Each structure stands twice: as C-alpha cells, then as structure tokens.
C-alpha cells in the first residue's frame, strides 16, 4: 500500500503545517500537525475541557462504530516549546491520504495547554518519531508509521514541505518527480528516539563551506532551525543590524534587510536554504524588527533541523531495519 496527503501551512509565516487525517467510522476528518520529533497521535476531542477548545475540530469517539476504549491507558506529553497535553486512549481506524491503519492508538485529550487552545488551526498531532518515545502508559503504543510499515510498498515516508505553499507527505514510496538530482542518504541514530543524524557542515551566503560535524534531529514539528551558537553567530554577523535580543528571545534583524542563504551539508551534498526562508516577520504587529529563522540551540540540549531547513529539501525518512535519512534538492 501507499498513501499521499497534501500538507498546508497554517499561516503566512509557515509556523506549522496541517495534514487532513480521517479517524473513525464514519470518518471524522481532523487537521493534524505531522511531527517527526514526537511519537504520539493525539487529538482534540469531545473529552477535552470545554474552556480549552477554541475553534478546533474535535474527535468524538462515541460517534465512531470502530472506536474502542483502550482500558486503563493514559498519556501525557510536554514539548520542547513548553506546551503540553494529556488524556486517555482509544483504538480506531486512521487513514492518511488513502493509507489505512486499523487499531491505531488515538490519544484523546482531556487537557491541553494554552498554546494549543490558542491555535484554532491545529486539531492535534501525528507523531512520526520512533515509537520508543510514545507516552502511553502502562502499555506503550506504536506510531501510525510503525503500524503501517509492514503493509507499505517500501518502509518509508517522505516530507516535501512548501515555502509559503502546500506540500506533500507520502507513505510507502519515493516520488522521483518531486526532487532534482539524487537523494543523499545519511546514517541515523535512534538512541534518543529521534531521526538524529550528523550534518557535515555549513556555509553562509556565498561564503566558503566549513566542514564540521553537527549532530541534530530532523523535526517537522519545529518551525525554525536551531544550531550551535558559533554557527548562528556566524550567520547573523552577515546581516547589518542583526542582534540577539534577550527580551525578544533570539536573534532579530531589521525588516529592511535582505538575508543571505544558509547551506548545510548532507555527506558530500549541500542543501541551500534561501535567505527569504529565514525571515519570520515583525516581532510584533507593525514593528520594523523581524524575527530570525535560524536560532541558537544552546538552551535546548540538541540541534534541530526544523521546517526552515527541511522545507528546502525533499526528505526521506527510511524506516528499514537500519533507519536512515535521505535529502535531495528540489
């Protein structure tokens, strides 16, 4: 089998991307944030505290003839941005772009933190990291990809995120028309549960490439590119007036600037992030200070190749017995 679904930016800055997902019988379609940095499929539901729902579409398990309570199971997750959610668990039928999994754990939110409530466009998350990170207790559950893998034509999914435009998640096949050149594959460590790999270096604009190993994760659920402070300083030093602001929470730059590109290495290959992809717009409405899309990871504990980097590439998440990542230009 295969599946193919369009993923759409939630706003004009590409802050996140939503993909429609069919849950239950008859189908209830929810727009989920596909997150290669986590491993829980959770949704706003008829169980979510009513004051914490503000415009999201909810899953109602009582209206699904295939829903079954997973007795005794609970879940609770906290994300890198400080947000969180928790609840109980059903199994139900879940389809993405024509690909169907029966018996998928659908984690029904009883509580969500304010950032989720405040984002009316995201109805939940669909995790695509390794199932060892799944938070369901006392019986850990598998991701949608893990459950589908054996049925897929090839044990892979791909992320093709757009810049200010829709893109595509494919399951089970590699669309050879969706990228230019060749795909360069690179080793993955699953030891932390992430699609963790090592970039071979970077360049700023037309500058020379610096060969240096940068361990980080491919994370579709993070908006920006988080890299070591040395690399990030070298980038912003090329933008007149750019500075790190503790009050804003990162690097800002004059909105009048033209930003340089940023290149990252994948083995001997190179992915170029155009400068415009690194502009996240005014820090507050009407400001002439703009927020940068490359930020320091020094406070995180890990480097994160988020959407800013991934949207510049066609990315293969290869879930073979030994997983690997592939990157192509497009």
Curated annotation (Swiss-Prot):
From the record, give the cysteines joined by S-S bonds. Answer: 255-290
Q: Return the broad EC class.
A: hydrolase
Alphabetically sorted, this entry's keywords are: Aspartyl protease, Disulfide bond, Hydrolase, Protease, Signal, Zymogen
Q: Which residues form the Peptidase A1 domain?
A: 17-328
Recorded catalytic activity of this chain's protein: Hydrolysis of proteins with specificity similar to that of pepsin A, prefers hydrophobic residues at P1 and P1', but does not cleave 14-Ala-|-Leu-15 in the B chain of insulin or Z-Glu-Tyr. Clots milk
Report the EC code(s) recorded for this entry: 3.4.23.22
Q: Name one GO molecular function term.
A: aspartic-type endopeptidase activity
Q: Which residues form the active site?
A: 35, 199
Q: Which GO terms describe its biological process?
A: proteolysis
Q: Does the keyword Signal apply?
A: yes
Which protein family is named in the record? Belongs to the peptidase A1 family.
Q: What is this protein called?
A: Endothiapepsin
Which residues of the intact protein are shown?
90 to 419 of 419
């Amino acid at each position: 089998s295969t599946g193919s679904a369009t993923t759409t930016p939630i706003d004009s800055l590409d802050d996140a991307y939503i993909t429609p997902v069919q849950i239950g019988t008859p189908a209830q379609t929810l727009n989920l944030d596909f997150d290669t940095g986590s491993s829980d499929l959770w949704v706003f539901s008829s169980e979510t505290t009513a004051s914490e729902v503000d415009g999201q579409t909810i899953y109602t398990p009582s209206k699904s003839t295939t829903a079954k309570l997973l007795s005794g199971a609970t879940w609770s997750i906290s994300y890198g941005d400080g947000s969180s959610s928790s609840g109980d668990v059903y199994t139900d039928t879940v389809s993405v772009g024509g690909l169907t999994v029966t018996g998928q754990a659908v984690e029904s939110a009883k509580k969500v933190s304010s950032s989720f409530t405040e984002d009316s466009t995201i109805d939940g998350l669909l995790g695509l990291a390794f199932s060892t990170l799944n938070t369901v207790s006392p019986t850990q559950q598998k991701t949608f990809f893990d459950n589908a893998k054996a049925s897929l034509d090839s044990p892979v999914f791909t992320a093709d995120l757009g810049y200010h435009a829709p893109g595509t998640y494919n399951f089970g096949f590699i669309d050879t028309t969706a990228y230019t050149g060749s795909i360069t594959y690179t080793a993955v460590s699953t030891k932390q549960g992430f699609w963790e790999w090592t970039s071979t270096g970077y360049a700023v604009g037309s500058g020379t490439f610096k060969s240096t190993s940068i361990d980080g994760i491919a994370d579709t659920g993070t908006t920006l590119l988080y890299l070591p402070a040395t690399v990030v300083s070298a980038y912003w030093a090329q933008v007149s007036g750019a500075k790190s602001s503790s009050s804003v929470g990162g690097y800002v730059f004059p909105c009048s600037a033209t930003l340089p590109s940023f290149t990252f290495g994948v083995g001997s290959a190179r992915i170029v992030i155009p400068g415009d992809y690194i502009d996240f717009g005014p820090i507050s409405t009407g400001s002439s200070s703009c927020f940068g899309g490359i930020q320091s990871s020094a406070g995180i504990g890990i480097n994160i190749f988020g959407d800013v980097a991934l949207k510049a590439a066609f990315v293969v998440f290869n879930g073979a017995t030994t997983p690997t990542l592939g990157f192509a230009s497009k």
